[PDB]
Design a protein around this ligand. Sequence first.
Ligand SMILES: Cc1ccc(S(=O)(=O)Nc2cc3c(c(O)c2O)C(=O)c2ccccc2C3=O)cc1
Ligand SMILES: [Cl-]
Lengths: 234, 233
Amino acid sequence: AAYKLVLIRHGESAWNLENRFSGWYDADLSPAGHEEAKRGGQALRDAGYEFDICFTSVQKRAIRTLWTVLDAIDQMWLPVVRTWRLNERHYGGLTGLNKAETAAKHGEAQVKIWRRSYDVPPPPMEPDHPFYSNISKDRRYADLTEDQLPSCESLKDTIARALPFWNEEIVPQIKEGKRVLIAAHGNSLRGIVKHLEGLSEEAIMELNLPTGIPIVYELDKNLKPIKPMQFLGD
Amino acid sequence: AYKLVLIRHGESAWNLENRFSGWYDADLSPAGHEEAKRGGQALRDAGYEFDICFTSVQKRAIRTLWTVLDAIDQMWLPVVRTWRLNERHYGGLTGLNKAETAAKHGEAQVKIWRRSYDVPPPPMEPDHPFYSNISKDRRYADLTEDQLPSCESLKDTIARALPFWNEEIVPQIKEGKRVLIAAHGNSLRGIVKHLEGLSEEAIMELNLPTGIPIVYELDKNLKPIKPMQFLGD
Ligand SMILES: Cc1ccc(S(=O)(=O)Nc2cc3c(c(O)c2O)C(=O)c2ccccc2C3=O)cc1
Ligand SMILES: [Cl-]
């Protein structure tokens, strides 16, 4: 086809292992997550993939995944663009809580409702939240407007601030013929996949992208996929 | 009072820094990596923050930058890569050690190359082991015929580094962005020469230390207000 696009979700984070809601908390890769990013890199290398430009979030689990991939494929020299707009979903008050704490405080019913809903957000991260200053006052978000910096996000909110970056900064590069690598997060990548395949809310909430595995799209000139997404590996 | 930080990468693999590594894309050795880590830790201990980073398209400089950013928890910063901050291109000498260089070209000529500001080494010819590896590397595919060097004098290196400094780095500094530059001995020599208004002789005598943060305090005209400062112990 005309174009080729590659996506990868960051490998396992240290809070993926603790089973805690990271969201905008900047958790690093776990050692296993680093190995995942490395195997994804080796997969892209064995298949001879070349890129011209890379996009990622401002979160180090995604960034380190990109670094590990670029290292594996000997393309550390590529231009890299970072944006908060490819960040993980902001999980508001749930940030920092594990499964048990979440259920204990909100109940199994409320947790299932949040879990299965597309447009209902978790509660907001309030100023007394233990990660409030760590996230909301981080200087990497200093240039965001009052409206842009979320206290919480539904999957809808997430996709809503992710697709403008896709349309305005990524799409033109692709149509310029640049071969794009996007290393990011499950939910921000869900936005892109939903747009690409024209999926429904139910369908996208059913899609679970695996950590650290390359996802290949073959696109026509209008960025319509000519076939289903493909995973790279062994 | 603007604040500018430079860092020169450390040791590369296979003893390549003593083999005119030049435009060959040698990786850091584990020791060179550790140097970058100590420099990063130095910057962390001193509480330095940056807003933007510049580096070359060579992985020993890029991995130096990555290591520093990891160490100071600023992996999220915007990063700009440019061939214009590459190490000096050593042409036909690239990859040779001292004895091989003297044996192939003679002591007289080697001394002349070594002490001259504007005499380049011979070009890297098609039979050189790195000829296609460098000249055909796709990261330089957009360079024009004049821009892609077969060899460089120190004058040439500085001449292609300073327009990047002027056009891309200077505006950032003047907007108050705190700049980090991770690059190579000779490209950084170019910047230091421009900053301190040094002569050809002085800049050929200047040897910037590796893996140590180098701090400049500049006034509004980007003239240094004091000597360069090193961070560590
Ligand atoms: C940190 C964490 C706590 C609980 C779980 S779970 O065992 O219930 N599995 C799980 C849970 C959720 C989710 C999930 O995908 C899941 O596998 C969600 O997507 C989700 C979205 C918005 C609010 C809450 C959730 C949610 O709790 C997983 C991860
Ligand atoms: Cl980078």
